[model samples]
Target: KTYPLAAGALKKGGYVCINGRPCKVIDLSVSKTHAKVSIVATDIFTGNRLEDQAPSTHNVEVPFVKTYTYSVLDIQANEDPSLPAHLSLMDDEGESREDLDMPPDPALATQIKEQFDSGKDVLVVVVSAMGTEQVLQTKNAAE
Candidate 1:
């Protein structure tokens, strides 16, 4: 399935899908080790149903993630250091935070401890899109 995720949408962690579904791209081998260049396709975590094409172009975008940044709030410091003053300090449930497995620097333990103490949120603007495709399946789902 050829998904038009934009012009240059192919990287290591870029997202892919078929028919408005998300799929994990395990390996993206533009050109097979040998000759017969083949564009492969893989799957990640779609419920079921398999199709060869996407429902609509809007369904997927190489830059679906427009923004990715970190937020650090030092209660002892200032409520609004650089962030907007109008920014509320309330814990809103508008967006669910994603606990990621990310390693920032060498001292991970120290960083975690500091984050815990400061009560801040750390993030990164990492987006990847690579031209690779393969089959994907649901690891566990009883129906």
Candidate 2:
């Protein structure tokens, strides 16, 4: 349940961004000191796919991966009424808010609002870091 990022913790089909490319873990083998991993690259913005393998320790690295648990605080369209909608996420206990770059899909935003209104935890995605094309996708605080 507890392990470092480099400990072959990612499960097959789990998503991760490696070296600025979003990918899904296809296969993995863990040795005492290293991991061999195969990944199918993806265009996070488009859903296109590409594949590659990491046969050695050096290539087994996941440098920009991040995970966070958040509770939905609010969901609303842009104040200007022209831009997309956004989802406000906060710490699990509703103590802090996170700034985000991309807005939640309208459908997801609605889902978050409905779940939050009924006192349930809503799963959501947040863009964690921009430069490496990495987006930290947190399932839900309840998970």
Candidate 3:
């Protein structure tokens, strides 16, 4: 779920200061062996030769992918430059499950319907990440 920080948040391929020390996303891995996704981040820290890591080892929650876009910042002094591996993303608005707009999505719809038809208690979950979105939405069909 974590990515690399660019020059804006980093400098010269070194760590940048964020909530914690800024670092680059040297490598990332997603594990989906469970109900949720596990996001593993390996980063290079600043001022220290040691690499910093934040691994979601146990019961790591899967973040929904959101759809987003990036724009060029207009500056009077200098044009904003693209940082290597710098990925800027934001969620789009006014989008919903009803907007699926795909006939082939019936497989998903069927699963949802079956879960509902089971007459069991279900809760829906929705997560929106940068440029990607997902629905964990569930329905309660009381038996």
Question: What would the TM-scores of all predictions be?
Answer: 0.27, 0.50, 0.25
Q: Which residue pairs collide, candidate 2?
A: none
lDDT of 3 by residue, 1-143 (tens): 54443222222333222234323334333344322221223222122332332333332122224332221111121133332111122123523223221112345435544554465433334334433333423344234
**Model 1 / residue 114 / CA error / Å:** 5.7
Report the lDDT tens digits of candidate 2 across residue range 45-121.
44557555554443243434455556566666677777755556676565755454333344554555666677776
Q: Which stretches of candidate 1 lie over 4 Å from their true place?
A: 1-13, 19-24, 29-63, 74-114, 118-143
Write down the TM-score for model 3: 0.25
- Which sections of candidate 3 miss by over 4 Å? 1-107, 136-143
Worst 10 residues of 3 by lDDT: 69-78
Q: Which candidate is the best by lDDT?
A: 2
**Top-scoring candidate (TM-score):** 2
Model 1 scores worst on lDDT over the 10 consecutive residues at 133-142
TM-score-best of 1 and 2: 2
Candidate 1 Cα deviation (angstroms), residue 48 = 13
Q: How many clashes (backbone atoms < 3 Å, residues ≥3 apart in a chain or on different chains) does model 3 have?
A: 13
Candidate 1, 1-143: lDDT as tens digits: 33456312344445555444554444343332222211223433223433333222233432232223333222232255443111112123344333322332325424543554554453233222233221111111123
